[PDB]
Design a protein around this ligand. Structure first.
Ligand SMILES: CC1=C(C)C(=O)C(CC[C@](C)(O)CCC[C@H](C)CCC[C@H](C)CCCC(C)C)=C(C)C1=O
Length: 393
């Protein structure tokens, strides 16, 4: 069977009955704990009564701690309302709400420098509650249960800026929240206009995604508009995404419903940087240098780093290769001096040729002694299945 209302095996039927008894004591503090609702928790844990109960009880505690009953009435900070991209727009052919995610022009640095991480995550929880409320409205209007959503995930403009570690970590917090609190709610997700970086970028968040969620991700190729119109009526899709919908004023992007992000004006910043810790720490003597070595064997990889120096600037560059001088190696990112004592540095490098990469901190120009550099480096790998998907498409 399928474990859904109208299609339960004898054993799933019995488990649903037992489940309701087992969690009776939390059902009152839920808005609408019908059979559809309960079966989402049971499907998410394959009808394991004990695991499904832990999951739901954790969600009940979540709703209390995060004041979810009142979150739609909570108004997000102005900077977030103005610049957090994405939006609800249209319904698919089954009547499910469609949500657009717009990744390219999202300015995650600006957002984290202008608002609390807590307020950003609360805004995303609120989006989920708004989508569930829309499902409830569709349920009434269409005369049948609607409880899932279709996502259009627009990766046009996805680039190295989106790999910035604090942004990935924050997004991962949201994904975990989504997976723990909104099980069996995603129906299908279309990735559109994915660029070459998509396999690396996806691999960064893949660990936060449930198997159920992973299975619902469809990466689309050049014909993506035609694919969307297999699933959504043209008058429900913006002109921008292949349909006929516009803003009342005729704007093809339907900006009255979809936020397209943009860089946050610096007047909103409350900080210059987020709190950061580093995996490594070195004291570099006057006139000296420090090298850090990473083997990159596989095609498709990206080096990501962050560093800060204490009290003074430092030289930094990347070479391709035995304690070797810089001049003996091949330059891949030309050395330059950075003021990483003032604002911490972060960067990324696409590793087009395999070999041994050397990140070199350079103090050879300096009289200041015992310059302390703190740093973190990782080699980011592409997701293999995604690479293969790209290849064809
Ligand atoms: C608040 C917020 C922040 C701070 C943010 O950085 C991002 C982009 C995260 C990223 C890692 O920079 C870019 C990640 C790109 C990567 C290709 C994402 C792939 C996502 C998958 C297609 C699954 C999505 C899960 C869905 C079911 C919610 C988004 C979308 C935010 O909303």
């Amino acid at each position: 069977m399928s474990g859904r209302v109208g299609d339960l095996s004898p054993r799933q039927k019995e488990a649903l009955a037992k489940f309701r008894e087992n969690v009776q004591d939390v059902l009152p503090a839920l808005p609408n704990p019908d059979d559809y609702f309960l079966l989402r928790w049971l499907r998410a844990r394959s009808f394991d009564l004990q695991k499904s109960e832990a999951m739901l009880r954790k969600h009940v505690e979540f709703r209390k701690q995060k004041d979810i009953d009142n979150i739609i009435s909570w108004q997000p900070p102005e900077v977030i309302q103005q610049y957090l991209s994405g939006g609800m727009c249209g319904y698919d052919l089954d009547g499910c709400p469609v949500w657009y995610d717009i990744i390219g022009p999202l300015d995650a640095k600006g957002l984290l420098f202008s608002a609390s991480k807590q307020d950003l995550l609360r805004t995303k929880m609120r989006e989920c509650e708004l989508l569930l409320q829309e499902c409830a409205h569709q349920t009434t209007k269409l005369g049948r249960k609607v409880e899932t959503i279709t996502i259009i995930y627009d990766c046009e403009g996805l680039g190295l800026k989106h790999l910035w570690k604090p942004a990935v970590e924050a997004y991962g917090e949201f994904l975990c929240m989504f997976e723990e609190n909104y099980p069996e709610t995603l129906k299908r997700l279309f990735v559109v206009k994915a660029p070459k970086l998509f396999p690396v970028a996806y691999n960064l968040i893949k660990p936060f995604l449930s198997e159920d969620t992973r299975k619902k991700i469809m990466v689309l190729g050049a014909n993506w508009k035609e694919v969307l119109l297999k699933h959504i009526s043209p008058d429900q899709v913006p002109v921008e995404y292949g349909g006929t919908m516009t803003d009342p004023d005729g704007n093809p992007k339907c900006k009255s419903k979809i936020n397209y992000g943009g860089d946050i004006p610096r007047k909103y910043y409350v900080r210059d940087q987020v709190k950061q810790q580093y995996e490594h720490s070195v004291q570099i003597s006057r006139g000296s240098s420090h090298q850090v070595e990473y083997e990159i064997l596989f095609p498709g990889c990206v080096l990501r780093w962050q560093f800060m120096s204490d009290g003074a600037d430092v030289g930094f560059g990347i070479f391709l290769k035995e304690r070797q001088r810089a001049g003996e190696m091949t330059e891949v990112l030309p050395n330059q001096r950075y003021n990483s004592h003032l604002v911490p540095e972060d960067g990324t490098l696409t590793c087009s040729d395999p070999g041994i990469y050397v990140l070199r901190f350079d103090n050879t120009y300096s009289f200041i002694h015992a310059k302390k550099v703190n740093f973190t480096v990782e080699v980011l790998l592409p997701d293999k299945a995604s690479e293969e998907k790209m290849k064809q498409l």
